[PDB]
Amino acid sequence: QPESLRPVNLTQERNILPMTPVWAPVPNLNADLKKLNCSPDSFRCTLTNIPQTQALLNKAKLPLGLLLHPFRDLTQLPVITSNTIVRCRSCRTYINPFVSFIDQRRWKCNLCYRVNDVPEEFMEPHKRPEVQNSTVEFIASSDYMLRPPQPAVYLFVLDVSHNAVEAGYLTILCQSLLENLDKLPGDSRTRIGFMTFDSTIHFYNLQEGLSQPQMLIVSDIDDVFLPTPDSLLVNLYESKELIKDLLNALPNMFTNTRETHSALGPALQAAFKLMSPTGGRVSVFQTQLPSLGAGLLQSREDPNQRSSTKVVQHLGPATDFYKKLALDCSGQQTAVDLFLLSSQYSDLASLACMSKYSAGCIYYYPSFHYTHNPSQAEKLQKDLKRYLTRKIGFEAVMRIRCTKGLSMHTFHGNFFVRSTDLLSLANINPDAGFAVQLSIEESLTDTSLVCFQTALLYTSSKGERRIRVHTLCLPVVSSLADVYAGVDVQAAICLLANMAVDRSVSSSLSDARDALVNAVVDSLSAYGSTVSALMAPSSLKLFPLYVLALLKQKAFRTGTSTRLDDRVYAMCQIKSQPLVHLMKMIHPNLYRIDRLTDEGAVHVNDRIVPQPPLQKLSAEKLTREGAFLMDCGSVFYIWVGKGCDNNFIEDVLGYTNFASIPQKMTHLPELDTLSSERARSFITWLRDSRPLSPILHIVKDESPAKAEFFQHLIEDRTEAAFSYYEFLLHVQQQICK
Ligand SMILES: [Zn+2]
């Protein structure tokens, strides 16, 4: 009885959530191969023990899929420079650690089983880097480029309507660009340009030779007097001073502007045309519903929350304008990133398409205001530092190959699909995650092992064509028991979250929610067939809990009010957040922090970091005499109990007593106390584990912002949502019927 199969009575067990982070299940391969397997932080499967047939997979109920964070920053990476990149003659799989050499001069492909000759240059060919590491990166040549590797090109398209000016994001963006101007990935060929827009479209001529920027204003984006692209997307090094002058002036160019219109559509169409020749990255900053010209959007959100209980009203795009724009951009290797900083509905569902279909990124800062909502301003500052300095890959493509019999079925993420197994990524960034559901078209009886291999081809910021490859090997099994033994619950949950997004949009929120519950009912019913109480194998003991958490997440919840743009953003996050970050949004990590200690702590970055144990998401865990920190992935909350020890309030919060604690507190004082040092050290550790900067909110029991915290205690009953106990009873009833 492997331990992953040890029975767990979920009906009775009140302690199932581990105190420490859940580890990915190690694929059950022999010792030698295990050491060679792919990092689960880069590439993992929902079922580490692969079902031998589609019939067995169907009997299991669990979804078979892959999750990847293909371009994440790595501490070490074997870089291979060879005149010949060895690949299979029949399926083009890259030679890897799991192939077999049948004569030292020939290798058999582990995906299609065809025999290939080993090139002389590749030569003890089995001790080659490609065969000793499952994650490598090749430097490719002319045979992997249709044109010379494009230089880095950056274009900023900024909303300067009165609403946008009032918001005050310009100062933040321009200051960030100035501080990081010499840190943008690229070389001497790097080009950059700027555009602003209100009722008209504004271009900025920054060509070398000018003493100051020349602003060009047009209402017709096809104006024949407009200069050539070389004067708008200029060489960063050559026009450095002109660029800095523009960056210093922008925040004070539209002060108290009379313009209220935001012609985003025309601006983006002009951007497409400008970027078409080279491709690159477009960064769009929008603060309200596009109101003029092509692509203008209506304020269609339905105020009646109950009208969206079964089918979310206006959840899908209102038009295909932005999707079409993104597809056209992808065709020219142009990615479009959206930074939405609106205080009123702006139809993110429609706008998000500009990024979704161009491999772009979506950032959302609701009710952003430099002065009145400074936490969003500081967050943008930090998010921009990462956005502007992280590595980047241009004009990229990614293909995922798999052993014969296996097939890619549905991809999840931001990209332009070009095949059953090929994705076009105008840009590939190190923070993007992807997922894909698989199917078994032909029984996997040929061998006892299957392999999955991700190949990411891109142009580096230095002009080199590179191919980063990840190879994952998994054992094939023929019994249901074994399938349940190798399930990766968090991977399954993340894949189901993506499937639920598709179902909510194409069918209804009701159907998506029902399918999520059905996954639990079906899997545990199927499990029961292999063996008064809801039983589950250890591997799935957290499955019901995670599904309940998902059902209460902003994306799919129906019990409490949810603004449309807010729900859409939650869905966007599911589609692009790597598993490690997405799981915190699905099931927040709760910690008691008024009594942090050394014991258990770890040492990192040369400091002692407390390691408090994870607490289940229920008010039952909230000692009224303590303080707790909830990590929801994108935001932090610190709940302070009415009877919380004053030592904590005084030494950590910086106040005499509970009553003196202010509301709307978003920062922890840098107090010279041991407890403040521990708390801050802990929180700094949390922040350093992810690319984005979560805003911190200190919540008092007094009931104003209390709900924001209690809505995350997903194990408790609420308005129209089951408690964990009730949910299990519900699952049981369905299975017993
Ligand atoms: Zn092959």
| CA-closest candidate to residue 71, choices 529, 429, 460 | 429
| Same domain as 198, residue 108 | no
Cα(27) to centroid(ligand 1), Å: 22
Token duo for residue 233: 């997307």
Cα(444) to centroid(ligand 1), Å: 15
Pure H helices in 181-332: 240-249, 264-275, 321-331
Domain contains 360: yes
Cα(113) to centroid(ligand 1), Å: 6
Cα(334) to centroid(ligand 1), Å: 32
**Which contiguous run of DSSP H or E holds residue 234?**
strand 234-235
Cα(397) to centroid(ligand 1), Å: 20
| Same domain as 482, residue 449 | no
| Same domain as 93, residue 108 | yes
Q: Enter the DSSP assignment of 446.
A: S
| Same domain as 573, residue 655 | no
| Same domain as 452, residue 357 | no
Cα(35) to centroid(ligand 1), Å: 23
Cα(76) to centroid(ligand 1), Å: 28
Question: What does the alpha-carbon distance between residue 261 and residue 292 come to, in Å, rounded to a whole number?
Answer: 6
Cα(495) to centroid(ligand 1), Å: 27
| Same domain as 323, residue 235 | yes
Judge residue 215's burial from the number of C-beta atoms within 10 Å of its C-beta, 0-12 exposed, 13-18 middle, 19 or more buried.
middle
Question: What does the alpha-carbon distance between residue 82 and residue 46 come to, in Å, rounded to a whole number?
Answer: 34
| Same domain as 690, residue 606 | yes
Instruction: Provide the 3-class DSSP secondary structure of residue 144.
Output: helix
Cα(473) to centroid(ligand 1), Å: 15
Judge residue 255's burial from the number of C-beta atoms within 10 Å of its C-beta, 0-12 exposed, 13-18 middle, 19 or more buried.
exposed
Token duo for residue 605: 């970055």
Question: What does the alpha-carbon distance between residue 151 and residue 212 come to, in Å, rounded to a whole number?
Answer: 25
**Which contiguous run of DSSP H or E holds residue 378?**
helix 374-389
| Same domain as 449, residue 309 | no
Domain contains 446: yes
254, 202 in Cβ contact below 8 A? no
Place of tokens 């080993």: 118
Question: What does the alpha-carbon distance between residue 688 and residue 684 come to, in Å, rounded to a whole number?
Answer: 6
432, 363 in Cβ contact below 8 A? no
Q: Enter the DSSP assignment of 331.
A: H
| Same domain as 685, residue 563 | no
Question: What does the alpha-carbon distance between residue 50 and residue 56 come to, in Å, rounded to a whole number?
Answer: 10
CATH number for the domain spanning 564: value is: 1.20.120.730
Q: Which residues pair with 408 in a beta bridge?
A: 438
Domain contains 268: yes
Count of domains observed in the chain: 5
Cα(118) to centroid(ligand 1), Å: 14
CATH number for the domain spanning 410: value is: 2.60.40.1670
Cα(406) to centroid(ligand 1), Å: 13
Cα(410) to centroid(ligand 1), Å: 22
Instruction: Provide the 3-class DSSP secondary structure of residue 153.
Output: strand
Binding residues: 88, 91, 109, 112
CATH number for the domain spanning 618: value is: 3.40.20.10
Judge residue 653's burial from the number of C-beta atoms within 10 Å of its C-beta, 0-12 exposed, 13-18 middle, 19 or more buried.
buried
Helices (H) and strands (E) in the chain, counts: 21, 31
Domain contains 194: yes
Cα(88) to centroid(ligand 1), Å: 5
Question: What does the alpha-carbon distance between residue 216 and residue 598 come to, in Å, rounded to a whole number?
Answer: 61
495, 519 in Cβ contact below 8 A? no
- CB neighbours of residue 270 within 10 Å: 24
Cα(145) to centroid(ligand 1), Å: 23
395, 333 in Cβ contact below 8 A? yes
Question: What does the alpha-carbon distance between residue 457 and residue 501 come to, in Å, rounded to a whole number?
Answer: 28
| CA-closest candidate to residue 24, choices 53, 4, 8 | 4
Cα(94) to centroid(ligand 1), Å: 9
Cα(70) to centroid(ligand 1), Å: 22
Question: What does the alpha-carbon distance between residue 677 and residue 593 come to, in Å, rounded to a whole number?
Answer: 12
Domain contains 509: yes
Judge residue 606's burial from the number of C-beta atoms within 10 Å of its C-beta, 0-12 exposed, 13-18 middle, 19 or more buried.
exposed
Q: Which of 390, 422, 445 is the last residue before a domain boundary?
A: 390
What residues contact residue 524 under an 8 Å CB cut-off, 6+ apart?
A: 534, 535, 536, 540, 543, 544, 731, 735
Domain contains 146: no
CATH number for the domain spanning 352: value is: 3.40.50.410
The experimental technique behind this entry is X-ray
271, 295 in Cβ contact below 8 A? no
Question: What does the alpha-carbon distance between residue 304 and residue 562 come to, in Å, rounded to a whole number?
Answer: 11
What residues contact residue 506 under an 8 Å CB cut-off, 6+ apart?
A: none
Cα(415) to centroid(ligand 1), Å: 26
| Same domain as 165, residue 262 | yes
Cα(102) to centroid(ligand 1), Å: 15
Q: Which of 476, 496, 531 is the last residue before a domain boundary?
A: 476
Domain contains 311: yes
| CA-closest candidate to residue 451, choices 90, 33, 24 | 33
Cα(92) to centroid(ligand 1), Å: 6
Question: What does the alpha-carbon distance between residue 217 and residue 163 come to, in Å, rounded to a whole number?
Answer: 20
Cα(547) to centroid(ligand 1), Å: 38
467, 140 in Cβ contact below 8 A? yes
| CA-closest candidate to residue 371, choices 160, 172, 653, 197 | 172
| Same domain as 577, residue 633 | no
CATH number for the domain spanning 115: value is: 2.30.30.380
Place of tokens 């890619």: 408
- The angle at the Cα of 438, spanning 100 to 392, to the nearest 5 degrees, equals 80
| Same domain as 191, residue 283 | yes
Binding residues for Zn(2+): 88, 91, 109, 112
Residue 518's domain comprises 1-23+477-587+717-737
Q: Which residues pair with 94 in a beta bridge?
A: 87
Q: Which of 446, 476, 506 is the last residue before a domain boundary?
A: 476
Sign of the CA dihedral with 119 first, then 123, 124, and 128 last: negative
Domain contains 54: yes
